[PDB]
Homo-oligomer: A and B are copies of this chain.
Amino acid sequence: NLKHVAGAAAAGAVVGGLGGYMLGSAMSRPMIHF
């Protein structure tokens, strides 16, 4: 068998966000000018 604990389980303060799951891609081109 196999046994686990993953993530931030039993953490004292989970204040930051958690990672998501992307099964795919992302096309990105920010456009910043000033």
Q: Which residues of B contact A2 (CB under 8 A)?
A: 1-4
Choose among B16, B19, B32, B33 the residue that contacts A5 (Cβ–Cβ < 8 A). B32
- 20 example contacts (A-B, Cβ-Cβ < 8 A) are as follows A2-B3, A6-B7, A8-B14, A9-B11, A12-B12, A12-B14, A13-B13, A13-B15, A15-B19, A16-B18, A16-B19, A16-B20, A17-B19, A22-B22, A26-B26, A28-B28, A29-B31, A30-B30, A30-B32, A33-B33
| Chain A binding surface, main DSSP class | loop
This chain's copy number in the assembly: 20
Minimum CB–CB distance for A10 against chain B, Å: 4
Q: Which residues of B contact A25 (CB under 8 A)?
A: 22-27
